[PDB]
Amino acid sequence: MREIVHIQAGQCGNQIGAKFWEVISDEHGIDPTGSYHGDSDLQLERINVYYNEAAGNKYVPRAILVDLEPGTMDSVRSGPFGQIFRPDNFVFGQSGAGNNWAKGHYTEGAELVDSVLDVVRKESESCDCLQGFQLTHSLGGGTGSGMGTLLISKIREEYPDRIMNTFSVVPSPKVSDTVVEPYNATLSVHQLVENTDETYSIDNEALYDICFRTLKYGDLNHLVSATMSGVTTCNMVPFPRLHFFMPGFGNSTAIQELFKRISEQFTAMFRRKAFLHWYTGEGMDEMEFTEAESNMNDLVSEYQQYQ
Amino acid sequence: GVQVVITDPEKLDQIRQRESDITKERIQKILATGANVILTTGGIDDMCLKYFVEAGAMAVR
Amino acid sequence: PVLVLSQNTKRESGRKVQSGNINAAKTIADIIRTCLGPKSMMKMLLDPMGGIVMTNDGNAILREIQVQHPAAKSMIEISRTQDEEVGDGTTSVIILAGEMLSVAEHFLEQQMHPTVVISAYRKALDDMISTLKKISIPVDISDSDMMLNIINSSITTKAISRWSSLACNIALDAVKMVQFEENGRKEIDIKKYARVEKIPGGIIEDSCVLRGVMINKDVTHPRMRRYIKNPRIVLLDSSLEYKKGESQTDIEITREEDFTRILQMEEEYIQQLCEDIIQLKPDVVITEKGISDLAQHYLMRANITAIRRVRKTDNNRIARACGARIVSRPEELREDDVGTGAGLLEIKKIGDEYFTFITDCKDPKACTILLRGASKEILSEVERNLQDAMQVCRNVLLDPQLVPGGGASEMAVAHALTEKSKAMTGVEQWPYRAVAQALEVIPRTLIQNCGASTIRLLTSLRAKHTQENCETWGVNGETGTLVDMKELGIWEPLAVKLQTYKTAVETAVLLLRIDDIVSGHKK
Amino acid sequence: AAVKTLNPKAEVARAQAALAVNISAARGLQDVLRTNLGPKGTMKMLVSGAGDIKLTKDGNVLLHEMQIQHPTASLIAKVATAQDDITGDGTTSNVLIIGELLKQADLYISEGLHPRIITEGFEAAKEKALQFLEEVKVSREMDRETLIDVARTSLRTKVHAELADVLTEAVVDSILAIKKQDEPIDLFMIEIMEMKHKSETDTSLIRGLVLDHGARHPDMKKRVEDAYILTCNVSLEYEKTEVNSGFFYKSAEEREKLVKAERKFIEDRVKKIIELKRKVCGDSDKGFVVINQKGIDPFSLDALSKEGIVALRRAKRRNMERLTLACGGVALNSFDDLSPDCLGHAGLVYEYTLGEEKFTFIEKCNNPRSVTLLIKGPNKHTLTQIKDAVRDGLRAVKNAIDDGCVVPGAGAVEVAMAEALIKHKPSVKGRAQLGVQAFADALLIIPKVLAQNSGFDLQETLVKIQAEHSESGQLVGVDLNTGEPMVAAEVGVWDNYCVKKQLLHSCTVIATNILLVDEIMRAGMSSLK
Amino acid sequence: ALHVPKAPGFAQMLKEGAKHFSGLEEAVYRNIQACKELAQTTRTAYGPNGMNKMVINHLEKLFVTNDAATILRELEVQHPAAKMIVMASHMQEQEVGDGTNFVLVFAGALLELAEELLRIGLSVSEVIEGYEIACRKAHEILPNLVCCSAKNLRDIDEVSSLLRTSIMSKQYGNEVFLAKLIAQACVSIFPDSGHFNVDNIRVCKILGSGISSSSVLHGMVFKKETEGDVTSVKDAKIAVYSCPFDGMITETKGTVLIKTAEELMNFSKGEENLMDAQVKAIADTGANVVVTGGKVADMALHYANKYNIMLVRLNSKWDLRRLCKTVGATALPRLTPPVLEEMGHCDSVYLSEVGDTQVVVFKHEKEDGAISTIVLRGSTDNLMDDIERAVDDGVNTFKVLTRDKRLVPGGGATEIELAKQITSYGETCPGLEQYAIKKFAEAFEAIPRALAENSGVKANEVISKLYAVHQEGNKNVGLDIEAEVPAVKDMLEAGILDTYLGKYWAIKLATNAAVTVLRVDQIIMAKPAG
Ligand SMILES: Nc1ncnc2c1ncn2[C@@H]1O[C@H](COP(=O)(O)OP(=O)(O)O)[C@@H](O)[C@H]1O
Numbered sequence A: 001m002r003e004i005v006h007i008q009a010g011q012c013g014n015q016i017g018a019k020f021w022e023v024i025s026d027e028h029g030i031d032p033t034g035s036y037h038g039d040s041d042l043q044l045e046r047i048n049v050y051y052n053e054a055a056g057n058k059y060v061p062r063a064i065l066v067d068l069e070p071g072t073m074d075s076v077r078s079g080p081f082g083q084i085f086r087p088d089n090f091v092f093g094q095s096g097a098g099n100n101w102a103k104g105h106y107t108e109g110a111e112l113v114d115s116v117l118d119v120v121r122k123e124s125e126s127c128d129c130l131q132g133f134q135l136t137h138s139l140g141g142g143t144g145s146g147m148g149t150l151l152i153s154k155i156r157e158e159y160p161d162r163i164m165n166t167f168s169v170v171p172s173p174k175v176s177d178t179v180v181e182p183y184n185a186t187l188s189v190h191q192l193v194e195n196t197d198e199t200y201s202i203d204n205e206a207l208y209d210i211c212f213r214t215l216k217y218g219d220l221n222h223l224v225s226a227t228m229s230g231v232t233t234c235n236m237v238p239f240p241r242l243h244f245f246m247p248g249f250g251n252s253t254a255i256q257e258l259f260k261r262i263s264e265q266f267t268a269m270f271r272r273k274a275f276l277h278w279y280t281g282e283g284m285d286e287m288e289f290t291e292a293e294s295n296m297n298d299l300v301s302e303y304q305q306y307q
Numbered sequence B: 001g002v003q004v005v006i007t008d009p010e011k012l013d014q015i016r017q018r019e020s021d022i023t024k025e026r027i028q029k030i031l032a033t034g035a036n037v038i039l040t041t042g043g044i045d046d047m048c049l050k051y052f053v054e055a056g057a058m059a060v061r
Numbered sequence C: 001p002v003l004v005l006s007q008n009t010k011r012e013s014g015r016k017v018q019s020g021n022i023n024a025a026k027t028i029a030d031i032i033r034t035c036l037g038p039k040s041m042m043k044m045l046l047d048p049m050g051g052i053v054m055t056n057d058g059n060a061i062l063r064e065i066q067v068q069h070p071a072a073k074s075m076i077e078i079s080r081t082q083d084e085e086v087g088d089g090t091t092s093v094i095i096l097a098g099e100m101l102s103v104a105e106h107f108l109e110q111q112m113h114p115t116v117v118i119s120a121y122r123k124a125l126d127d128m129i130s131t132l133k134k135i136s137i138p139v140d141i142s143d144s145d146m147m148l149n150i151i152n153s154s155i156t157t158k159a160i161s162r163w164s165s166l167a168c169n170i171a172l173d174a175v176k177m178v179q180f181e182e183n184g185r186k187e188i189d190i191k192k193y194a195r196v197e198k199i200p201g202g203i204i205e206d207s208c209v210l211r212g213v214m215i216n217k218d219v220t221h222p223r224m225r226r227y228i229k230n231p232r233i234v235l236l237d238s239s240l241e242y243k244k245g246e247s248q249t250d251i252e253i254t255r256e257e258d259f260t261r262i263l264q265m266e267e268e269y270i271q272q273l274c275e276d277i278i279q280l281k282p283d284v285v286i287t288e289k290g291i292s293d294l295a296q297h298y299l300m301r302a303n304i305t306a307i308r309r310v311r312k313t314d315n316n317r318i319a320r321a322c323g324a325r326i327v328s329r330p331e332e333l334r335e336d337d338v339g340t341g342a343g344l345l346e347i348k349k350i351g352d353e354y355f356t357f358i359t360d361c362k363d364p365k366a367c368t369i370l371l372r373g374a375s376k377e378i379l380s381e382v383e384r385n386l387q388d389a390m391q392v393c394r395n396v397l398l399d400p401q402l403v404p405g406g407g408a409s410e411m412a413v414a415h416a417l418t419e420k421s422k423a424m425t426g427v428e429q430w431p432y433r434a435v436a437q438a439l440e441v442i443p444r445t446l447i448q449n450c451g452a453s454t455i456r457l458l459t460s461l462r463a464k465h466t467q468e469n470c471e472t473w474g475v476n477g478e479t480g481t482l483v484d485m486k487e488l489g490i491w492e493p494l495a496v497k498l499q500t501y502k503t504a505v506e507t508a509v510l511l512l513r514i515d516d517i518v519s520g521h522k523k
Numbered sequence D: 001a002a003v004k005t006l007n008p009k010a011e012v013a014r015a016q017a018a019l020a021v022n023i024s025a026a027r028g029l030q031d032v033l034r035t036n037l038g039p040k041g042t043m044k045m046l047v048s049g050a051g052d053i054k055l056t057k058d059g060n061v062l063l064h065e066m067q068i069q070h071p072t073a074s075l076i077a078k079v080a081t082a083q084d085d086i087t088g089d090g091t092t093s094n095v096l097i098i099g100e101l102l103k104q105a106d107l108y109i110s111e112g113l114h115p116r117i118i119t120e121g122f123e124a125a126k127e128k129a130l131q132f133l134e135e136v137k138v139s140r141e142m143d144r145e146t147l148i149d150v151a152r153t154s155l156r157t158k159v160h161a162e163l164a165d166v167l168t169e170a171v172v173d174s175i176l177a178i179k180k181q182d183e184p185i186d187l188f189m190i191e192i193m194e195m196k197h198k199s200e201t202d203t204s205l206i207r208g209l210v211l212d213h214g215a216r217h218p219d220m221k222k223r224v225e226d227a228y229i230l231t232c233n234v235s236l237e238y239e240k241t242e243v244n245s246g247f248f249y250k251s252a253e254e255r256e257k258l259v260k261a262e263r264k265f266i267e268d269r270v271k272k273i274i275e276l277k278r279k280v281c282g283d284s285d286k287g288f289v290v291i292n293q294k295g296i297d298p299f300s301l302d303a304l305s306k307e308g309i310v311a312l313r314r315a316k317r318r319n320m321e322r323l324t325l326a327c328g329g330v331a332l333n334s335f336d337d338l339s340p341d342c343l344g345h346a347g348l349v350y351e352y353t354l355g356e357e358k359f360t361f362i363e364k365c366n367n368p369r370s371v372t373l374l375i376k377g378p379n380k381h382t383l384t385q386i387k388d389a390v391r392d393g394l395r396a397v398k399n400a401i402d403d404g405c406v407v408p409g410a411g412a413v414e415v416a417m418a419e420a421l422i423k424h425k426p427s428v429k430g431r432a433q434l435g436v437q438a439f440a441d442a443l444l445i446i447p448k449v450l451a452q453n454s455g456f457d458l459q460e461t462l463v464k465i466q467a468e469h470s471e472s473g474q475l476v477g478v479d480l481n482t483g484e485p486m487v488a489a490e491v492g493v494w495d496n497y498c499v500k501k502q503l504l505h506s507c508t509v510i511a512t513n514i515l516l517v518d519e520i521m522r523a524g525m526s527s528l529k
Numbered sequence E: 001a002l003h004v005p006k007a008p009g010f011a012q013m014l015k016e017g018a019k020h021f022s023g024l025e026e027a028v029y030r031n032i033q034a035c036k037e038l039a040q041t042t043r044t045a046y047g048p049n050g051m052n053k054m055v056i057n058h059l060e061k062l063f064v065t066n067d068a069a070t071i072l073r074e075l076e077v078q079h080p081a082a083k084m085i086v087m088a089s090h091m092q093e094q095e096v097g098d099g100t101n102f103v104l105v106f107a108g109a110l111l112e113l114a115e116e117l118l119r120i121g122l123s124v125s126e127v128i129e130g131y132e133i134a135c136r137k138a139h140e141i142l143p144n145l146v147c148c149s150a151k152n153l154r155d156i157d158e159v160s161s162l163l164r165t166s167i168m169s170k171q172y173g174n175e176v177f178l179a180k181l182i183a184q185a186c187v188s189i190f191p192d193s194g195h196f197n198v199d200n201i202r203v204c205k206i207l208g209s210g211i212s213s214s215s216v217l218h219g220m221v222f223k224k225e226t227e228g229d230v231t232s233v234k235d236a237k238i239a240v241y242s243c244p245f246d247g248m249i250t251e252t253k254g255t256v257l258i259k260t261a262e263e264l265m266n267f268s269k270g271e272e273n274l275m276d277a278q279v280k281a282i283a284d285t286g287a288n289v290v291v292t293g294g295k296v297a298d299m300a301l302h303y304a305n306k307y308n309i310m311l312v313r314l315n316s317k318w319d320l321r322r323l324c325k326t327v328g329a330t331a332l333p334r335l336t337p338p339v340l341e342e343m344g345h346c347d348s349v350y351l352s353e354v355g356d357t358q359v360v361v362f363k364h365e366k367e368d369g370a371i372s373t374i375v376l377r378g379s380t381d382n383l384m385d386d387i388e389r390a391v392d393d394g395v396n397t398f399k400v401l402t403r404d405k406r407l408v409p410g411g412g413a414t415e416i417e418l419a420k421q422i423t424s425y426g427e428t429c430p431g432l433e434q435y436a437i438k439k440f441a442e443a444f445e446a447i448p449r450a451l452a453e454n455s456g457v458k459a460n461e462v463i464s465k466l467y468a469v470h471q472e473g474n475k476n477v478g479l480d481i482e483a484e485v486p487a488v489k490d491m492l493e494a495g496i497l498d499t500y501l502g503k504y505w506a507i508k509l510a511t512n513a514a515v516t517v518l519r520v521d522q523i524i525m526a527k528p529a530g
């Protein structure tokens, strides 16, 4: 069994991650300290692919936590199961980075990737045989967009022969959640299509609806974790470009809806060039947006090929 | 409804190259008539755009 | 409740709507009124991303502020339009539109119809265009000194005025290098092929335009050379890795040797790609996609330096600069696609980062302007000013006609319009003469921002412009005195001033046509 | 106001308000950072929201760690960040000179003088001051003694005196080791590793490399004397085929054959390594160390241990170059045709365990063009402080080498430039003489703060120093132990010409732009939501 | 006029919940007060008469101990200066293993006296100068205060007498038994080479009986059962596999592709015949015990039972590695029979029941090996954890003695001699440094003062007696805890001794921590997250 390293970026990512690392820890008996307060041996059967046992029988998780703003990782330390993590796997900057994709993907938080990469190496070295990585982030939003794609990128350059299984919080259709979300999400999809091997699209809108059905902000990070374990607790991606998924209970072409929406709001804003000065004045060329758009019409047509 | 299932590794290379040579041949057939302007409702990969560039044609996707 | 329209649909109408639109417009104008001329002052804007924008540029300011009145929205949009079209005059246009709407408010209060005012405005616009074209002068664009003076006359009103000679030379070199012709179509694309890279630190006086391009990149492998004195360069859109096929190419192994044979086939594929590349005997290979470590091995064995993941725009600029042609299949590589023309590839450490220079090119049709300075904000402002300068140089190289600045053109046109109005006997003579006197706002604003006596100076200037050969007389924005522009040297591009006048008059026409606001209704 | 009629929830600072706001924030930053300046400065403690402790005297670190939300403070922090990224030192002095320029300009603007005229005087004085700096710079053959004095002038300000006397020799030797004649200094070739076990004065220079990892096979030796180093970038773990493959068998025997066969590809690379090892080490006299940038699975680790090879996995992309420069081999991305010329030599290789971490030392290289600084210390915050200090010192020595000139310190150049500016002032036309005077009184903030921090009267000390410099013309500064004037070039207090020039340039520029700010305005969305 | 506004500048630019302290009053004195409170929280645990504390952490876990570093770890210290003193104490624990409470006491004393000196009018710079020169003098002096040395670490009576002192502060009532146990273990695992590894002393805490039933075991104990039917073995030939005890499978997805009824009928029989062959090769190598780090398959277990092999499953990889070190084996990643060198040996391997707990014991008969285990019996998990901490103290003392064999007298004797000599040095040193030197000297008095206070006697009378005897010349005299009244006796002749390295590092680290706390002048706390 090969080991899987788990990076989590941005507020959304850092708050899905902790909940996942808690669900599974309780699925394995590990307490907040790390001691295996468990009886069954199936919990230890496949525990090496997630936890990196140390001397003293303390199972440290193979998890990195990243965000340009420290205040989320502080809330993760202080939260529950916030002490199993390695006190050095917390990599944070000082700049908030707003919600600009260019800010997170460029010199405005670019050196940090060189601090998360010497933690990816220090976490892969422990792994006997590294299966790959699992990055949890948000498609568009805060740093998760920019920093979540400069990470997929630099980790596909540094380890270009490993499974990169992303969990991204695709933006909900009703809630804009941000004025530059169409841009961030087309710019991030434009990187994930190339530098990723399998992407699970976790829609906040659908997750919120499922939570309401169960009832008949935390509740969403508690309704995404049981799906993240039903995906990572045990024949897909026929074509190496249609690797986007919608979990449930699905490699559906309903993704095409989300993509049509994102590309039509992208095109609406791009026509008037609204909120473009920030990207150009901080390190993008006005042609990266045309490329992103082209590549999203590409995706939408590849997905329209079936029906 | 078509799958590639290889049981002799020596065919993989030719199959992979054919996947691109098909489009290459279509583009060459189009350009052989004298077409210097090519309008398309669909997409055009970079591999194809390079053929148009070398031919001195104008392609639009 | 039995309504006909949904609640939240509020409908205003009439002179209240007209006066509201006009007040919103002239408020947008008053926001940036003081940012005009050489003696303007900076404004510190606070971005929603915790950023800061320290600028004098009307379009920068209006782009960073947010409004809810649709008239103010329209004014911001016309400022953006002016900036995108000519790249200068973004506050002159705003001020002119504000003044035109202000003077039209008068006639609107006095029972004149907005359509009458609008027709008068259009007559006046046509005559403004005629008068500008009459008072314009030509330019010998081969006179580098004349072009440098034009660029100084365009950047003197900005922060870089302290480094005027430097910025003028940078802009002129950049535009003259980006000037490109293919198939009988001249094209100055200073947005795709003139690149500004801001590296904080250093001093601005070492900023330069490179005879080549610059990217933030390092060699893929430290055994690769970092200095090449006549590099033959190859550009690729394809990954030199072994990637999967487009189909369901699933394999089925039953024999023992087959797994190893497949891995060795992958290695041999990479070898064959690298051999297809080496066959052209290049020195540098630059890719937009990845380069596998085995490919790096083979290239290094061939003594080739590789750069892994460059942007598509940077790759296009490298193509234009070094004379190469981007390829996507190394089997389809030809000597004509190889890049000869670069005189030096250097990879040097600026601060704690590695930057790749492809400079010393001969006939480079692309460039990188390397800006150095105190901080990201100072360098953003310098970059905006350089964008203004290059856009002015481009406008000149396109339309070599010049008109005098310092408000001299505004006063000349106002005088010509007042003289032409004496033949008008209908009721439109009054709004016509009103826009004529509304053009005086540019010299008025110049005098206000220099700190001189508007009444006295504008009177002396209107009097000077009543003489015969005095249409070149204007004002100093630095001393508050009248001068001849032939002696001062402030000459604007006819295209710039035409676009200014046209956009202003049409914005006034639009906002005058507008009445009866409606709101609330949801898409 | 105008903006508030269109965006009602808009914040605006106009003309005088704007200037008051900016100058107040600048003076606040100056008030905080005044105490950082000089070796007699005070160390500030900085506690994160999580509770992590930072002990620092560094202006840039202090800026970024302070809890501030002011636009002018952000501007000045950015100017300091650029200063630090390009020169490594001068951030505190940068902030101080900005604050004092703003104060001296407010002194005249409150009396109705225009900031434009003050900025004209600022630019004239900047020009003349740069000229005087070029005049006073001391072009010197950069010998170890000069570099030691420079690194001392930096490290004594950044850390304690005994630790500074240690870091001085460490840093100077490191740079003098990784430095090639007429070849820009790649500071990347100086690794900086921190160990958290011993005293802070144990910080040393290892003439080799220190990797933060060791061998992952227990039977592998922990010490190797005469070692052949193989720097490779070749995966020695199980690699799956790019195209989806899968195995199909009809019997457990066939399954066993396929299990043995699926590893043949990596076994072949292991065999190549083992054959090279046997060919170069015909006996157990010498040693053989494989250092892989990529992974090594347990089967390969066992196969190499059986042959007596020490294999390290997942090294750093920088350690590839550092190893090829220290040991002297060739870093490989393939074992196609590997030969003994691809190997480096290390006169000693061993392993050091510290709690849960392991370290690997590679020492006794012949003439390593890459070295490492081992930062030893009892606390994480001590280690961070020493890291910052050695960064400062490395940048200082590198700059003193690059610019063969070096400028006297202790405020001597500032005093002399103030005197020169005051003698040049009459040659300035109009009321820009007042801007020149303000520039001079701003330059005089370095000796003033040095005296204030050593515990002396600013005016009395500065009067003594200016008098001594006017009577003799010698470049004199503050003696931080007696408050008397002293010749910095004779007592060995040196500053970086590049740092002083960057100070002048960037401080003038940012102060000019701030003085020319006449409206601060927040009228955007105010959030990206 | 009813509100004081924040002053212009940093006070206004400061964030909402951030705090800024500056100067002797707001920063230095408050830090000294915090460190003093810390030293007071841990003072009553110092020495053999030190009392235990029951700290409950945020996870509702209970710690009953008088181990300073443990108490500090389990407390939620939130003041940064106290955090720094705790960092010093933990560095002392890491470097030496004993002396954390000394570090705390001494740092707190140095800081209290530094506050006193600042109040009388010295500057932090002068205080730090004097503290540093006095620490240097103390380091110069201590080697001369060294009284005895170990002279042999392969014996069991000498080693027990040497560890008794370190294991007296903890578990004062019963220390001869524990010193015997820890000496037996340390000298069993002490190799002919001078290197001693503390991880080779294993501690098994088993419920039931009490500390007098504890024992040493030359080998290993695992709270496991056997996977198969065999439970005892008398001439173990252990074979260790890091791989599961199952048929090897492909790392790439394997599929059993059947195309004929014959293949379908024969697949399972072929699989079983293969497993039988594998395990029979292992058994025919002579191995009677197999230890797998992975899982066990039903068929493999069947055939191991058939061929009379004891199967053991060690979930942990550290457990597997330590068993390999114990028995002299090599973990094989394949299920191939081991060669004569890859195999391990034990004089016995058996399943036993210590109390309610079932355990598998790999027991050597020889009085040596690479690993030894101490089986701790006890009536309470907290009691057994405290005894494990005492064992850790004894083992780290043994390692310190392997590093440096020098010993100084305990019970405050070295502290009093240091105080005396540094006072005599400061009386000669002129300048304002003498005040700080004399306070650094007086700080040492805090150690015998804390010992006396916990012993239950008048610390002032004790310290006066000690000063008198050390003035008349006896440097090995310290206080007698076995006395209802203030008393003193020869620490050397009594056998109460400390480690030169322990004292050296404790003094160094305490001085460095105090000096850093003093060097702090401004504090800029951020808004506490949460
Ligand atoms: N030194 C000067 N003296 C007087 N007028 C000037 C001077 N420099 C520029 N101008 C005039 O100021 C007007 C606007 O300058 P500028 O601020 O660059 O444009 P905008 O106001 O559109 O930003 C130009 O029409 C030009 O004629």
Ligand SMILES: Nc1ncnc2c1ncn2[C@@H]1O[C@H](COP(=O)(O)OP(=O)(O)O)[C@@H](O)[C@H]1O
Pocket (backbone or CB within 6 Å): D036, D037, D038, D039, D058, D059, D089, D090, D091, D092, D093, D094, D153, D154, D156, D157, D158, D408, D409, D410, D411, D446, D450, D477, D478, D479, D480, D493, D494, D495
């Ligand atoms: N031993 C010394 N005696 C007198 N002046 C010194 C001494 N060491 C440094 N200085 C001066 O103190 C000033 C500030 O030093 P430092 O704090 O290292 O730079 P910065 O303030 O930019 O961080 C320097 O300009 C230097 O000239």
Ligand SMILES: Nc1ncnc2c1ncn2[C@@H]1O[C@H](COP(=O)(O)OP(=O)(O)O)[C@@H](O)[C@H]1O
Pocket (backbone or CB within 6 Å): E045, E046, E047, E048, E050, E066, E068, E098, E099, E100, E101, E102, E103, E165, E166, E168, E169, E170, E409, E410, E411, E412, E451, E479, E480, E481, E496, E498
């Ligand atoms: N029998 C004894 N009589 C007097 N003092 C003793 C005796 N045993 C130990 N001590 C003293 O107790 C101190 C150890 O206390 P302890 O709680 O171990 O502190 P630390 O763990 O920080 O060393 C030593 O300084 C030693 O001198």
Ligand SMILES: [Mg+2]
Pocket (backbone or CB within 6 Å): C088, C089, C154, C157, C388
């Ligand atoms: Mg302009």
Ligand SMILES: [Mg+2]
Pocket (backbone or CB within 6 Å): D089, D090, D154, D157, D392
């Ligand atoms: Mg400094």
Ligand SMILES: [Mg+2]
Pocket (backbone or CB within 6 Å): E098, E099, E166, E169, E170, E393
């Ligand atoms: Mg003790």
